[PDB]
Amino acid sequence: SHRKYEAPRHGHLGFLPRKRAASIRARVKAFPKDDRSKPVALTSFLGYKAGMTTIVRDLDRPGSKFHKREVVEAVTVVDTPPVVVVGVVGYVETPRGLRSLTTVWAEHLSDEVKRRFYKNWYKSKKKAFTKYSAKYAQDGAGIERELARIKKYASVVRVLVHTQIRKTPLAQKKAHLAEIQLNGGSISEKVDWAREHFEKTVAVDSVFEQNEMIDAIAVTKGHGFEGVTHRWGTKKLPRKTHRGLRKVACIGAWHPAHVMWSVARAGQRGYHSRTSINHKIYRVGKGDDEANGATSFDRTKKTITPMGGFVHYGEIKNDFIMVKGCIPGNRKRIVTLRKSLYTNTSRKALEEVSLKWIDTASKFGKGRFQTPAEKHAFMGTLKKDL
Amino acid sequence: SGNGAQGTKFRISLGLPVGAIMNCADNSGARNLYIIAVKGSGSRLNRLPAASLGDMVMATVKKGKPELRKKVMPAIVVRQAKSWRRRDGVFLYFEDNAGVIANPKGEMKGSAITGPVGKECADLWPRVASNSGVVV
Amino acid sequence: MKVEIDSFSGAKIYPGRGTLFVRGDSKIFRFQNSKSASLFKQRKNPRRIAWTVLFRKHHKKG
Amino acid sequence: MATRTQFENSNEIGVFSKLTNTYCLVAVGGSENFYSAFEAELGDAIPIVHTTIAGTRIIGRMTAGNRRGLLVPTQTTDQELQHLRNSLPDSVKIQRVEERLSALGNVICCNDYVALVHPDIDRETEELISDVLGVEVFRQTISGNILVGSYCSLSNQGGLVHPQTSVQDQEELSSLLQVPLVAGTVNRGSSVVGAGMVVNDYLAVTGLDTTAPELSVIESIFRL
RNA sequence: GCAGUCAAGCGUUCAUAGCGACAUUGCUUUUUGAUUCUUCGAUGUCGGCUCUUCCUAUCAUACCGAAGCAGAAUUCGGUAAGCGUUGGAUUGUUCACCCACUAAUAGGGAACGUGAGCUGGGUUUAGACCGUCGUGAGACAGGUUAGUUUUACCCUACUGAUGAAUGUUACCGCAAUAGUAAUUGAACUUAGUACGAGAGGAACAGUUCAUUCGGAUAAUUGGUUUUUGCGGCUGUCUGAUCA
């Protein structure tokens, strides 16, 4: 028998299987395509998601209905500590894909990547990299041997970085190590760049910029085990149904005498690796930059932190990317921001924008005020000090 | 939305499905309308075609002059009372629902329109805008 | 960019904050949040709601 | 020359445009064939200003005024008002108008001499209208229609009115307005004639559905 | 039910743009028959709701060929199911015909899919009514009403979740394999141009939005509320208060 009314499926068979991610750090599966002409730089960046806020900007889209007119839209603020390099690693192209042939670590690693290797830091003898730090006693014949082998071989060059988790209002103290590919020409130049930038700050005023489309890779918010209505979208059954009205009703035909892989079942919803492309950056704000939240129309001295801090996160005194729209991943997750794979000639990209108003009212209620000086103006003096 | 309308309207919220009786807000003689489908609407299994502000609906008349009764006629929604989002920031909603009878090109069968008219309707339908009173 | 004043309490309304209401006589009302709106749809008199502005402006509060 | 013009499919020029003696206000969302009929015969006579009013494109029915004034409603923003202040010359008088009864273009059907408005507008706004425009404001409805802006196009030479109108009210408005009136239609007999075309002393742009017997009566009564 | 081959004639003329008589070769198993090999120490027996997958004899979409294709609309066909195929009234419906939108309202299979998934309107136990037939008990190829639908805690399949061992342990990765996803319309423009005697009247590229789907989020908006968080109110009980 045919379906008697034919409908679009529930859910998407390409985001299968829906098991949980490896860890909270989402692997970047692929990096932008390399051309050996650009100056040497990074491809991705690691940060932490601080929440959302509201942006009033002048839409400038010729031929639209709101041309040169104010709109409001949502942005996510993703926090940015200056990410610091602690090593490089080169891969040789083999007939079974790229294979890491050697890796080189820096000289004096910070205690955060020394905290990353230990499940039990407090018991430990804290002996991370001791017999590797002893390899700098001579002029460095082993280490320069390793770098000459990376120069001779290894068509691609990736760099082990980590975030500086202590500069964050988090409470974790452990840094997430990662790899980042490079875009410059002539891999000797890449690895000399890496050897120069061992243990050096790399801030986002060099990797990203204003108005540019970036992809964002993170792990989904976790909602645990889940039933098949809210997971897949399947119709609830009527009121009258014995044995469960929030289900898939029919599992399948008689023959195939097995349950198909494409029917909707109950399982894990959330905590998957997701990737969302073409997100526009509206601000690249800086930590030493006082008054992040002023604008050329606004001009009042305030940060992008809401009154009373971001909910569940803290207060941004750090750099930040401020990116249009939503983003996969909730607050306090390691979010990886990546340069675009293709050049985006679409006129939704390449729209050079500047903001007009950043919302910094309290996200913890219905925020009636943006700055506390404004509240002391409006609400007036109280039963406190005077 | 649909053929014969002038301009493109950004998506505003659908709060009037098949069967909604709206307080007909012109002097044409109809006292109320009754949505029977929406021009330009799409198809999904067990989904009612819903109307919104400014959209053209086929509708009938359940009251009024008995010349106007018992016949399917085009109509145009001018108030919604389900809150839709303008791009400039606001979510906004009228006191009630409303509608005016039209021809398939957009002319008012009546002459005058009473009360408010939402501007996302008046910009899409020109003939309504001229007979309109309060815009927004 | 305009800072709209409220219709019920008297607070200030940032862009994208609260609803807009058009009563059928086309007198448009703006509401700060869900609170002052849902009080206004009870037809409360804002001159006798003790935390609003037209209350405090009338009894000379500060 | 009653030039026939589409606004991209439609033939009511009075919706998307406001034609006066010193200024011409037009919508922004149009092609060159909508503006060639204006810019060929006008050329270097009056400034044509591309703008919007109150977040719409119906600025012919939103604002209403004469050679001396341009009255703007509530929802017109700061940037639109500043661009119209810098674009239009200093002879016109622009004023924000507070009324919740209609839009201003549907209410006011006026010229340089005599205004006819909606009968339900109050006294404080009427004093503002007669102050800014400098026009003795009168209060009348044509053929029962309370919107005189939709069924009456007015100029200093003459005027086109609602097609189903008795001769007695035509003679009363000919004694009041001191102009001769002839009841006619526009755009293959469309009854909405207050928006079907614009007119001033030099130009009267009509719609493409206007045939020759309607156009001859229009160019006879407005005396181009 | 579908498709050929031949081809008398229609089609202004002209067998084959499209059709096609008289004949004739087949395919299919979504009909119904014929048989009765399996099941009567019992595979739960109509319809709908739900949900996945598959075929193609394609309705729409993509790209093209032919015309009695000027344009527009159509008609015949080729690769192709990749993706989509509806909301309603009456009826238990399958089918059905209607209203209305739509780009389109294609056809089917999977134990005439799917009852330890549902509902139980129909059929088909026992009650009862009417008509007809019967001498009667009762029969109905007919109408109407009222009528209980049980179990998963096994193996497997599927979806999710851990896991001993290849020196231990941790971090950073590669990729075999397996899945995949986007879809479609409207308006403006080209443009009352091309094409046309006129009536009528497009397309290619561009711009702005939208339909169905999919994944995410929660600033704002709405919903939920045991923050029983704050305020109010009834009845009673703490002697009244306060709580």
Q: What is the CA A3 to C1' E29 distance in angstroms? A: 20
Name every residue whose Cβ is closer than 8 Å to that of residue A32 and which is 6 or more positions away in sequence.
A43, A181, A183, A338, A339, A340, A341
**Cβ atoms within 10 A of the Cβ of A138, count?**
10
B103 touches chain D (CB under 8 A): no
Query: Cβ atoms within 10 A of the Cβ of C52, count?
Result: 21
Cα–Cα dist B132/B111, whole Å: 10
Residues A168 and A318 sit within 8 Å (Cβ to Cβ) = yes
Indicate if CB(A123) is under 7 A from strand E: no
Find the angle CA(A333)-CA(A334)-CA(A339) to the nearest 5 degrees.
130
Q: Which residue of D has its CA nearest to A66?
A: D55
User: What is the spatial distance between Cα B26 and Cα B65, in angstroms, rounded to a whole number?
Assistant: 13
d(CA A165, CA A114): 13
B8 touches chain A (CB under 8 A): yes
For D80, the closest chain A residue by CA position comes to: A69
Q: C4: which strand partners?
A: C13
**Omega within 30 of 0 (cis) for the link into A17:** yes
How far is Cα B71 from Cα B67, in angstroms, rounded to an integer? 9
Please report where in the chains the tokens 């589409």 appear, as a residue: D6
Report how far residue D223's alpha carbon sits from residue B26's, in angstroms, rounded to the nearest whole number. 36
Pick from A18, A83, A77, A42: nearest CA to A219: A18
Q: Where are the alpha helices (DSSP H) in chain D?
A: 13-16, 32-41, 59-62, 78-87, 104-107, 123-132, 167-177, 212-221
∠ CA A140-A145-A149, nearest 5°, is 150
Experimental method: cryo-EM
- Tokens 């930590």 correspond to A287
SS3 D193: coil
A67 interface with D at CB cutoff 8 Å: yes
What sign has the CA pseudo-torsion D224, D149, B4, D7?
A: positive
Does the distance separating the beta carbons of C28 and B90 come in below 8 Å?
no
CATH code for position D85: 3.75.10.10
Q: Which residue in the set A6, A8, A71 is minimally distant from B87, CB to CB?
A: A71
Pairing of strands D4-5, B116-117: unpaired
The conformation of residue B24, written as its DSSP 8-state character, comes to: B
DSSP string, C4-57: EEPSSS--EE-SS-SEEEE-TTS-EEE-SSHHHHHHHTTT--GGG-TTSHHHHH
Beta-bridged to residue A355, according to DSSP, are: A57
CA-based nearest residue to A65, from B87, D16, B135 = B87
**Cα(B117)–Cα(A89) distance, rounded to whole angstroms?**
66
**Can you give the resolution of this entry in Å?**
3.6
Distance in angstroms (rounded) separating the CA atoms of residues A35 and B132: 60
Buried b (16+ CB within 10 A) or exposed e, D30-42: beeebbebbeeeb
What backbone phi and psi angles, to 5 degrees, belong to A56?
A: -95, 120
Number of domains in chain D: 1
Cα–Cα distance measured from residue D49 to residue D26, given in angstroms and rounded to the nearest whole number: 6
What is the span of the domain harbouring residue D100? 1-224
**B135 phi and psi angles, rounded to 5 deg:** -90, 140
d(CA D94, CA D88): 10
Q: What is the dihedral angle through the alpha carbons of D29, D32, D34, D39, rounded to the nearest 10 degrees?
A: 120
Length of chain A: 386
* CB contact at 8 A, A116 and A162: yes
Q: Which two tokens stand for residue D104?
A: 């201003």
